[PDB]
Structures are given as C-alpha cells and as structure tokens.
Amino acid sequence: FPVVLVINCGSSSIKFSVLDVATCDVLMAGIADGMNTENAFLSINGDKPINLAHSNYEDALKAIAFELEKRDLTDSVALIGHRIAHGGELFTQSVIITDEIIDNIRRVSPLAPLHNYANLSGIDAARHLFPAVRQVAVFDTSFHQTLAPEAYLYGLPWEYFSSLGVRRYGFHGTSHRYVSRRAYELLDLDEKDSGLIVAHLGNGASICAVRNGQSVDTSMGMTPLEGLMMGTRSGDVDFGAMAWIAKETGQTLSDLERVVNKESGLLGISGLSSDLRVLEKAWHEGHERARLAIKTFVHRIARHIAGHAASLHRLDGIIFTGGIGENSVLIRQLVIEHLGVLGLTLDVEMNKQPNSHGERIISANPSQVICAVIPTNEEKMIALDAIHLGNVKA
Amino acid sequence: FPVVLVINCGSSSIKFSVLDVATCDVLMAGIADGMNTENAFLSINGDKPINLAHSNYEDALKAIAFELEKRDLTDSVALIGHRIAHGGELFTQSVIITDEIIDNIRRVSPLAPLHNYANLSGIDAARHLFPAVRQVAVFDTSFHQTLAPEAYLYGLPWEYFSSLGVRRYGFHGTSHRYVSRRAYELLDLDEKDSGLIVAHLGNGASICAVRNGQSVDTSMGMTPLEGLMMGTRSGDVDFGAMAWIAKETGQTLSDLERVVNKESGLLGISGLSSDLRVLEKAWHEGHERARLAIKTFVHRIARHIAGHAASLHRLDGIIFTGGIGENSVLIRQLVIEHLGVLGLTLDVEMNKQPNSHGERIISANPSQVICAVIPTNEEKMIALDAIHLGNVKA
Ligand SMILES: Nc1ncnc2c1ncn2[C@@H]1O[C@H](COP(=O)(O)OP(=O)(O)OP(=O)(O)OP(=O)(O)OC[C@H]2O[C@@H](n3cnc4c(N)ncnc43)[C@H](O)[C@@H]2O)[C@@H](O)[C@H]1O
Ligand SMILES: Nc1ncnc2c1ncn2[C@@H]1O[C@H](COP(=O)(O)OP(=O)(O)OP(=O)(O)OP(=O)(O)OC[C@H]2O[C@@H](n3cnc4c(N)ncnc43)[C@H](O)[C@@H]2O)[C@@H](O)[C@H]1O
Numbered sequence: 001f002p003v004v005l006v007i008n009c010g011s012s013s014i015k016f017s018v019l020d021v022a023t024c025d026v027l028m029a030g031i032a033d034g035m036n037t038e039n040a041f042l043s044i045n046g047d048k049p050i051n052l053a054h055s056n057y058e059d060a061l062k063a064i065a066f067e068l069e070k071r072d073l074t075d076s077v078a079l080i081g082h083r084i085a086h087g088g089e090l091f092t093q094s095v096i097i098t099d100e101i102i103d104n105i106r107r108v109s110p111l112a113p114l115h116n117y118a119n120l121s122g123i124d125a126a127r128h129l130f131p132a133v134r135q136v137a138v139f140d141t142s143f144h145q146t147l148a149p150e151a152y153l154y155g156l157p158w159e160y161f162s163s164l165g166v167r168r169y170g171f172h173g174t175s176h177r178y179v180s181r182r183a184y185e186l187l188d189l190d191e192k193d194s195g196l197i198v199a200h201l202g203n204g205a206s207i208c209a210v211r212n213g214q215s216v217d218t219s220m221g222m223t224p225l226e227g228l229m230m231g232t233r234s235g236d237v238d239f240g241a242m243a244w245i246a247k248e249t250g251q252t253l254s255d256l257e258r259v260v261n262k263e264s265g266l267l268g269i270s271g272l273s274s275d276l277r278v279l280e281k282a283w284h285e286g287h288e289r290a291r292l293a294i295k296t297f298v299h300r301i302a303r304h305i306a307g308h309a310a311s312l313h314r315l316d317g318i319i320f321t322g323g324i325g326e327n328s329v330l331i332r333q334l335v336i337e338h339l340g341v342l343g344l345t346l347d348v349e350m351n352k353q354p355n356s357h358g359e360r361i362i363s364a365n366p367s368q369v370i371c372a373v374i375p376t377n378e379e380k381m382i383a384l385d386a387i388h389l390g391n392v393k394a
Numbered sequence: 395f396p397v398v399l400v401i402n403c404g405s406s407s408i409k410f411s412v413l414d415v416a417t418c419d420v421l422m423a424g425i426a427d428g429m430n431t432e433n434a435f436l437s438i439n440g441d442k443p444i445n446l447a448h449s450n451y452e453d454a455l456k457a458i459a460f461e462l463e464k465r466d467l468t469d470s471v472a473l474i475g476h477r478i479a480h481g482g483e484l485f486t487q488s489v490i491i492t493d494e495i496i497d498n499i500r501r502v503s504p505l506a507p508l509h510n511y512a513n514l515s516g517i518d519a520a521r522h523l524f525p526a527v528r529q530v531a532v533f534d535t536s537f538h539q540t541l542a543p544e545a546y547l548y549g550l551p552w553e554y555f556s557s558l559g560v561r562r563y564g565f566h567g568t569s570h571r572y573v574s575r576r577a578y579e580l581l582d583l584d585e586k587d588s589g590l591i592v593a594h595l596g597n598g599a600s601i602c603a604v605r606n607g608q609s610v611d612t613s614m615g616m617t618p619l620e621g622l623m624m625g626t627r628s629g630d631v632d633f634g635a636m637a638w639i640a641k642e643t644g645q646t647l648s649d650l651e652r653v654v655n656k657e658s659g660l661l662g663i664s665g666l667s668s669d670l671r672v673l674e675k676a677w678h679e680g681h682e683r684a685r686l687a688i689k690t691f692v693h694r695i696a697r698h699i700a701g702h703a704a705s706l707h708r709l710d711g712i713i714f715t716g717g718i719g720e721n722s723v724l725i726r727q728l729v730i731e732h733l734g735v736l737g738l739t740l741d742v743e744m745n746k747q748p749n750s751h752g753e754r755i756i757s758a759n760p761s762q763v764i765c766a767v768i769p770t771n772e773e774k775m776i777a778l779d780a781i782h783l784g785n786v787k788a
Contacts, residue, residue, distance in 0.1 A: 111638075150689040154635065155628035157653065157662040158683060164642060166635055195735070217697070223634025234549035239631055240617025241548065241560055243651040244505075248558060253647045257637040259551065268551040289552060295544040299705075303611070307701030311693075312735050341589070341706050 002078035003027060004383040005068070005130075007061075009082070009122025011114045012036070014060050018073060019383045026379070028073065032060035035118075042067075057121035058128065065129045079390050080126050080135040081382035083174070084119045086112035087139030088165065094142070094385040096394050097123060097135040105137065111165065111222070136386040143173035146214040151311065168226070170218030172200040176208040177215075178381035179321045179374045184213075186359050187317050187370050195312030197305050200376065201331070202322035203231040203274065207301070209308035217311040219304050225260060229300045231274035234264035236300070269293035276324050276331065298331060302338035315342065315369050320362075321376045326355045332362065336371055343368030396472035397421060398777040399462070399524075401455075403476070403516025405508045406430070408454050412467060413777045420773070422467065426454035429512075436461075451515035452522065459523045473784050474520050474529040475776035477568070478513045480506035481533030482559065488536070488779040490788050491517060491529040499531065505559065505616070530780040537567035540608040545705065562620070564612030566594040570602040571609075572775035573715045573768045578607075580753050581711050581764050589706030591699050594770065595725070596716035597625040597668065601695070603702035611705040613698050619654060623694045625668035628658035630694070663687035670718050670725065692725060696732035709736065709763050714756075715770045720749045726756065730765055737762030 001020070008015045014032040019025065030044035032052070040055045042063050052063055068074045082097065088108030095101050102123065109116040126135060152168040153161060160166040176198050183198070184191045191213040198208045205228040209217040219227025229235035242256055251259075267274040270293040272282055282290030309315050318339075320332055329352055336346045345367035353360060355375060363371035395414070402409045408426040413419065424438035426446070434449045436457050446457055462468045476491065482502030489495050496517065503510040520529060546562040547555060554560040570592050577592070578585045585607040592602045599622040603611040613621025623629035636650055645653075661668040664687040666676055676684030703709050712733075714726055723746055730740045739761035747754060749769060757765035 149686055150693040153663065153686065153690045154631050155623035155658050155662055155690065155694075156631065157657055158665055160639065164639065166639060168632070221632030221635055222638060223632055225634035226630075226632035229549035234633075236620075236630055237548050237550065237633055238562070238615030238617055238620035239628075239633065239636060239651070239654050240619030241615055242633060243647050244616060245554065245558065245560060246647045253637050253640045253650075256647075257633070260633050263551055264549050268549055269547065271552055292543055292547065295542075296547045296549065299544040300549075302704045303701045306704035307697045309735050310696045310700035310733055315735055339704055341703050341709055 001076055003073060003076045004079040004081055004386050005077050005126075006081040006379045006382050006386075007083065007122055007126060008378075009057060009118050009125075010035075011118050014057065014064070014122065016064055017379045018068065018077075019379060021078060021383075021387055024380050024383055028068070028071070030064065030067075032064065035060060057118065058125035061122065061125040061129060077130060077133055079383070079386040080130055080133050081379075081386045082119065082123055082126065082135065082137050083378070083382060084137050084139040085115035085171075086169065087141045087145075088169070089145065091137075091139045091142045092145040094136055094138045094382075094389065096389050096392060097127075097137050098394065101137055111169070134386075134390060136382070136389050138174055138382045138385055140171045140173045141169045143177040144168075144170035144208070144215045144218050147216060147218070151217050166222060168218070168221050170206065170208070170215070170220045171224055172204070172206045172208070172218075172220070173215075174378045174381050175200050175321060175376040176206075176210070176218070178378060179319055179376050180208075180210045180213070182359060182374050183317055183319050183372065186361070186372055186374060189316055194316050195309075195314045196317045196319060197308050197312075197315070198319045198321060199301060199305060199325055199335070200322045201228075201301070201320065201325035201328075204233070205230040205301075205322065205324070207304045207308045209311040211312050217308045219308065228304060229269075229297050230265045232262050232265045232267045234260045234268065266293045266297060269296055276328060280328070280330055294331065294334075298334040298338060301331075301335050305335070306339060306342060309342065317370045317372060318344070320371070320373045326373055326375050332371075332373070336363075344371060346371065395470055397467060397470045398473040398475055398780050399471050399520075400475040400773045400776050400780075401477065401516055401520060402772075403451060403512050403519075404429075405512050408451065408458070408516065410458055411773045412462065412471075413773060415472060415777075415781055418774050418777055422462070422465070424458065424461075426458065429454060451512065452519035455516065455519040455523060471524060471527055473777070473780040474524055474527050475773075475780045476513065476517055476520065476529065476531050477772070477776060478531050478533040479509035479565075480563065481535045481539075482563070483539065485531075485533045485536045486539040488530055488532045488776075488783065490783050490786060491521075491531050492788065495531055505563070528780075528784060530776070530783050532568055532776045532779055534565045534567045535563045537571040538562075538564035538602070538609045538612050541610060541612070545611050560616060562612070562615050564600065564602070564609070564614045565618055566598070566600045566602070566612075566614070567609075568772045568775050569594050569715060569770040570600075570604070570612070572772060573713055573770050574602075574604045574607070576753060576768050577711055577713050577766065580755070580766055580768060583710055588710050589703075589708045590711045590713060591702050591706075591709070592713045592715060593695060593699060593719055593729070594716045595622075595695070595714065595719035595722075598627070599624040599695075599716065599718070601698045601702045603705040605706050611702045613702065622698060623663075623691050624659045626656050626659045626661045628654045628662065660687045660691060663690055670722060674722070674724055688725065688728075692728040692732060695725075695729050699729070700733060700736060703736065711764045711766060712738070714765070714767045720767055720769050726765075726767070730757075738765060740765065 018028040207219040345364035412422040428434040601613040739758035
C-alpha cells in the first residue's frame with residue numbers, strides 16, 4: 001500500500017500531504033509554519049499545533065518524518081514530490097531529482113531566490129531523511145514553456161532577454177495543467193482541437209490560455225507581480241506611474257516593490273483585508289472601498305480572460321479555480337457578466353452551488369462558451385507525475 | 395474667409411496647421427523643431443528650413459506668426475486651438491481658454507510636467523501674439539474621463555489614488571474621439587447603441603473601447619508608458635522584472651524609466667529602428683529580430699484589442715488608425731488574423747489598398763465584426779471644437 005509524500009517548502013512554511021498511490025486520496029496533511037523564526041510550529045490536520053521553536057527547514061521535515069513513522073507511514077513512502085517555484089527555461093516537464101537537476105534548479109534560482117532556495121532547502125532535507133526513496137521535482141513554470149517568443153518577450157531592449165533571461169515565465173503551472181486536463185473530460189473536448197481559458201483565482205491569481213493542450217499565454221510575468229490584481233499584489237501597473245510616485249514620495253524601487261507585492265491588491269484598495277469573504281460581506285454591509293476593490297478585481301480578470309482568448313483559434317471553455325474561483329458565487333457571476341461580448345450566459349442556479357458539488361458546469365445552454373468550476377489539486381497533479389516517473393529507469 | 399490656427403507645442407517642437415473654417419481644409423502646415431536648442435529651425439511644408447538658432451517657444455511662434463502675415467493669413471485667424479497633453483481630472487471636454495483654464499492646466503501639470511509646461515509656453519506665446527483672438531484648449535485625456543473607477547484604478551493602496559491622483563488617464567483622446575465619431579458614419583452605427591475598439595497605432599500607440607459613444611477603457615496609463623508595445627516604449631512590463639533588473643545591473647528607477655521610454659519597443663527588440671517600414675523590409679530581407687519585434691508588437695495589440703472588448707456589451711467594429719494603422723497592410727492583417735477567436739474575416743484586396751483610399755472597410759461579409767481603416771485628423775477635431783466654441787458667449 002505505497003504512498004507519495006508531497007512537499008511545498010515555501011519561504012516561511014512547509015505544506016505537506018501524503019497521498020495513496022492507488023487512489024490518490026489524502027491520508028495525511030499539514031503545515032510547518034513560522035520557519036527560520038523563534039516561534040515555529042507544526043499543525044497536522046489542525047489538530048495539535050506542536051511547538052518547534054527555532055527550527056530550520058530540515059528540522060521541520062525531521063519532525064514531519066517522525067509523525068509519518070508514529071503512524072507507520074514512513075515505510076510506505078514509495079515516492080516524494082517537490083513543488084519548485086521557478087524552473088527558468090531549463091525545465092519543461094517534471095523530472096526525477098538527481099545531482100544534475102539540483103545543479104540546474106540552483107542555476108535558475110536567481111530568478112526566484114527567496115522561494116527557490118527554500119525549495120532546495122526542502123529537497124536537501126528530504127534526500128537526507130529518505131535516501132532510498134525516488135524523488136521528483138514539479139515546477140510551476142514548466143507548463144508555460146510552450147509560449148512563443150511573441151507571447152513571452154517584453155518590449156525591453158533585446159540585451160535584457162539574451163544576457164539576463166528577462167522574459168515572461170508565468171506561474172500556477174501545475175494548477176493550470178491539472179485543471180485543463182480535467183476540463184477536457186468535464187466538457188467532452190478533444191485536447192488536440194480545443195481552446196480554454198483557466199482563471200486560477202486564489203491569494204495569488206493568474207490566467208492561462210491553453211490551445212490544443214498547450215499553454216500559449218499566461219498573465220503572470222518573470223515574477224508573480226504581473227497581470228491580475230490579487231490579494232496583496234497590484235497586478236499590472238504603469239511603470240511611468242511607479243516612476244512618478246518615486247519622485248513624489250522619495251521611495252525607492254525596493255520600497256515600491258514591497259508596496260506592490262505586500263500592501264496592494266484587494267488589501268490595498270479596500271483598506272480592510274486581502275480576504276474575499278471579508279470583502280464580500282463588507283460590500284454587503286455598504287462598504288464602498290470593499291465594493292471598488294472587488295469591481296476593480298473583477299474588471300481586470302474579465303479583461304485578461306478576453307485578452308488571453310486572442311491566443312486561441314476558438315474559445316470552448318472558461319474554467320474557474322483556486323480558493324476564490326471555486327468558492328465565490330459573486331465574483332464568478334460578475335466576471336461572466338463582464339464577458340457578455342464573448343457570448344457567455346450564466347446559469348445562476350448552477351453558479352449558486354457550493355464547492356461540495358465539485359467539477360461542474362455553470363453556464364446556460366445558449367452560452368457560446370461553456371463555463372465551469374473545477375477544483376484544482378496541485379498535490380494530486382504532483383503525485384500523478386511522481387507515480388508515472390516511478391515506472392522509469394534512471 | 396476665417397481660418398483656425400492649430401498648435402501642438404511639444405517638448406522639443408511646435409507643430410502647427412492653418413485650417414479653413416468653412417471646409418476644414420489645411421491651407422498651411424509646418425513644424426518648428428530643435429526647441430530650446432542651439433540649432434533651431436522652422437520648416438513650413440518642408441520647403442525652406444529657415445534657421446532660428448537659439449529660440450524660445452515664443453520666438454518660434456513669432457516666426458510662424460510672421461509667415462502667416464507674409465501670406466495675409468494673420469487677419470483671418472478667427473480661432474486658435476491648442477493641444478494639451480494632460481488635463482488630469484479637471485478637463486472632460488474642450489474649453490475656451492481663460493485665466494481659470496490656465497491655472498487649472500497649471501494645477502494638473504505635475505502629471506505630465508515636460509509636456510504640459512511646453513503647452514503652457516505655447517498658450518503664453520499665442521495669447522501675446524493674438525490678443526483679440528478666441529482660443530481653445532483640447533486635452534488628450536479628456537475623452538477618457540468617462541472611465542469608471544474599476545477601469546481607471548490601479549491595484550495600489552488607496553492612499554496613492556486619493557492623495558497623489560495616481561490613476562489611469564489614457565491618451566490619444568482627440569484621435570480616439572475623432573476616429574470613433576467617423577466610424578459611426580462609415581459603419582452605419584447608432585452611436586448610442588454601439589461598441590467599437592479603436593487601435594491608434596503610430597510612434598506612440600493605444601487602444602480605446604468606446605461603448606455607446608463613450609470611452610470605457612483605454613490602454614495607456616497615468617503616463618504613455620502603459621499598454622501596447624510601441625516605437626521606443628516597452629508597453630506593459632512586469633514591475634517585478636524591473637525590480638529584478640535594478641538589483642542585477644545597478645540601475646535606478648530613473649535609468650530604467652529612460653530605457654522603457656526611449657530605448658525599448660520596436661527599436662528595443664529589433665536593434666534596428668523604431669520605424670515600422672524599416673522593420674517590414676528587414677523582415678522581408680530575412681532579419682529575425684525585426685520579425686520578432688513585429689510579431690511581439692502584433693501580439694500585444696491583438697491581446698489588448700480583445701481585452702478592451704470585454705468592456706463592451708457587443709463588438710460592432712475594430713478601427714485602425716495612426717501612421718502604422720493607416721499604412722501597414724501587414725500589421726493590420728497579422729493583428730486581425732490573431733483575432734479569429736472574435737470571428738473576424740479579413741478582405742485582403744480591401745486590406746491591400748493604400749491610405750489614399752481613406753476611410754474604408756477591410757473585412758469580408760461573413761466577418762462578425764466590421765474592421766476598418768479611418769485616417770485620424772486631430773487638427774481637424776481640434777478645429778471643429780474651436781468652431782463650435784466660436785459660437786459661445788464668455
Ligand atoms: N516571488 C515568487 N516567485 C515564485 N514563486 C512564488 C513567489 N511567491 C510565492 N510563490 C509561490 O507560488 C505558489 C502559489 O502561491 P499563491 O498564488 O500565493 O497561492 P494560491 O494559489 O493563491 O493558493 P492559496 O491557498 O494561498 O489561496 P486559495 O486558493 O486558498 O484562495 C484564498 C482566497 O480564496 C478566498 N475564499 C475561500 N473561500 C471562499 C468563499 N466561500 N467565498 C469567497 N472567497 C473565498 C479567500 O477569501 C481568499 O481570498 C506557492 O508555492 C508560493 O511559494
Ligand atoms: N509623457 C507624456 N505625457 C503626456 N503626453 C505626451 C508624453 N509624451 C508625448 N506626449 C504627447 O502625445 C502626443 C502624441 O504623441 P505620439 O503618440 O508619439 O504621436 P503619434 O500619435 O504616434 O503620431 P506620430 O506622427 O508621432 O506617428 P505616426 O502616426 O506618423 O506613425 C509613425 C509610424 O507609422 C509608420 N508608417 C508610416 N507609413 C507607413 C507605411 N506605409 N507602412 C508601414 N508603416 C508606416 C512609421 O514607420 C512609423 O513607425 C503628442 O502631442 C506628444 O506631445
């Protein structure tokens with residue numbers, strides 16, 4: 001009864017899950033949190049916030065490793081999956097982790113230094129604690145590697161691309177990939193003659209155009225800062241505006257980077273919260289800046305969905321996913337009503353249904369494009385990649 | 395036989411034209427150039443590049459004022475029209491210039507300091523040299539003042555909007571307005587139940603969604619730096635990318651501002667020229683970076699056209715205009731082929747025709763959206779506003 005241990009070893013946390021290989025069901029989940037800090041803890045299933053004060057990335061996983069052993073799981077771990085933030089141009093698919101892969105992840109790390117050096121910290125720990133276990137790296141950029149240069153180039157001087165690697169990469173690749181594969185079933189589409197837009201709407205948020213099974217445009221950039229407005233991120237912002245602000249307030253690029261990344265977005269406009277549930281209720285209670293944040297948020301989503309549609313030969317489906325996309329009856333409806341130009345017709349009884357109803361269509365019959373909600377499952381996508389790679393000879 | 399003197403008094407030049415009131419035809423045109431410099435000259439109709447070494451904004455216009463008098467035109471100048479770069483939120487239409495208007499243009503000047511202080515330099519000169527002549531200010535931002543907050547807000551903290559006025563303004567307002575008014579005739583549309591996208595494609599470039607006669611979205615930002623890739627401007631650029639470059643090369647926000655504004659775009663990608671004719675031929679001659687610049691250029695136009703379409707209830711027309719939009723058979727075709735998702739069908743015999751054929755439809759009958767080329771005429775739009783305002787009592 002083999003299992004897969006999935007790890008996302010972020011800048012300040014290690015989220016993990018243990019999935020059964022035969023059914024891909026979660027048997028255990030958890031989050032080590034407050035990493036590299038004095039107050040570090042490990043909450044499995046939100047059941048016993050066990051203190052692990054002053055603990056590194058390997059300590060957290062050595063904690064977790066014991067918890068699997070306390071449950072006799074350690075000896076069924078046949079595979080380990082690692083979520084990697086950034087694969088630059090080197091990674092176009094998931095790979096069995098070897099010394100070469102480590103070097104290569106290390107080479108692309110300058111593109112996402114905070115997050116990639118935490119991913120490597122996690123691989124290092126896992127390799128120690130599970131030496132006879134095959135391990136697999138799954139990159140959030142890799143699905144977007146099929147973008148053409150016209151879709152990934154910035155209008156900067158060519159020098160910045162060829163010597164410094166400045167180009168669009170895009171993220172949420174594992175979600176976009178997973179969700180698009182699931183849409184071909186739900187919508188009864190032929191992958192190889194199909195056109196989808198996937199709106200991954202969580203705390204971080206991005207659109208992806210998937211033409212014939214392949215990503216052909218996505219909204220995030222070299223960094224997660226491009227495209228949609230999100231929880232705390234501004235989304236697309238006029239560089240001339242940012243330069244004008246600099247002069248006016250004395251702020252530096254670094255300062256404004258923090259603002260754009262940590263204090264902007266739903267949080268920034270509303271002045272209340274990055275949380276959409278909080279803001280939905282605030283609007284309901286007559287809050288005006290909450291209403292503006294959401295309307296702005298919706299408008300930028302509508303605008304990118306339509307804009308990413310231009311990279312398709314035909315639009316068969318729009319799929320919503322993520323915490324916001326799976327759960328917000330309002331935002332889904334607002335966005336879809338903002339896309340009447342594309343011929344969309346919402347079915348509000350279908351749109352009203354909670355996420356418990358799973359993969360589900362939410363558009364009427366007259367609708368020229370199918371709209372659906374498809375809960376993402378990144379941990380399952382990582383495990384399926386791991387399972388496949390478990391049959392390989394290295 | 396009254397005439398209107400139209401002036402665009404830019405950062406380094408004064409373009410002018412003299413239009414007949416009864417027919418709106420150009421009787422005289424010219425460009426004072428190399429302003430605030432040692433080598434300053436005045437080329438009327440490209441006929442006698444008259445040297446005017448070391449001359450201010452009033453000297454240039456005093457030169458021009460004499461040339462009108464040498465042609466007995468000075469005494470038929472019934473109206474003067476001034477092109478203003480930026481009207482902030484104060485100007486929503488064209489106005490008879492008074493002391494109040496001057497103060498107000500001066501108040502909004504921090505939003506576009508280079509260009510607005512040159513506009514005021516031009517008003518100052520014209521007011522002196524033509525004291526009994528009614529004068530009119532026409533702002534490139536004013537047409538976009540009908541944008542809703544959701545369409546003009548950035549995802550920055552609310553503070554930056556309410557105290558510093560950081561919002562989208564958009565430009566090419568006079569062109570977008572002019573061209574959209576002309577499209578209602580060409581396409582036999584009712585202005586009040588209509589949806590247009592106008593692609594103003596020149597050296598500077600922007601899209602505008604015009605719903606029921608009103609601008610509801612546009613691609614430029616607080617500054618001309620947002621949206622489309624253009625001649626020397628990058629267009630939309632990931633702020634995270636720009637911050638990453640800063641760290642890597644030691645460059646400042648100011649440095650990167652210059653790069654983004656003056657060295658990027660068609661120029662930047664190709665390494666050859668900001669000129670599209672040069673690049674069309676370069677591609678034809680097998681040049682790869684010329685081909686990439688154009689493809690990138692086209693792709694970002696297609697993406698914004700479709701994205702601005704989301705702000706319409708229905709898409710009746712896409713209109714091309716500007717030096718590139720009026721004259722590039724290739725780019726028009728490429729862009730339209732990149733929008734097959736919207737149901738466009740090009741008529742290539744119609745698309746092949748040069749600009750001499752004027753306002754013209756370039757789409758087939760099956761096409762679900764009419765596509766057209768409509769030569770812009772900003773000087774005529776300014777004069778028509780002036781003519782109307784000549785009937786007012788101040
Ligand atoms: N610089 C960088 N470079 C490279 N990689 C980087 C990076 N920075 C970060 N990364 C990486 O990017 C990856 C993804 O990061 P994120 O983009 O931040 O993660 P996410 O997909 O938004 O998922 P999350 O769980 O945070 O939000 P959820 O969908 O629950 O959605 C939460 C939202 O859903 C809403 N919601 C939930 N239920 C709701 C309901 N019933 N109604 C309305 N809203 C609801 C909530 O209110 C909330 O607003 C991470 O691995 C991270 O390490
Ligand atoms: N920071 C700021 N804030 C506020 N306001 C500001 C500002 N900076 C500037 N402004 C103002 O914005 C206004 C507009 O500026 P711009 O945006 O720069 O002007 P434009 O509309 O591009 O017109 P231009 O004449 O330069 O180019 P054209 O259409 O001929 O098109 C030229 C192109 O067409 C191409 N072309 C011509 N014929 C062609 C053919 N046959 N085939 C292919 N291409 C052709 C050419 O190759 C060339 O590439 C100005 O008043 C300016 O002062």
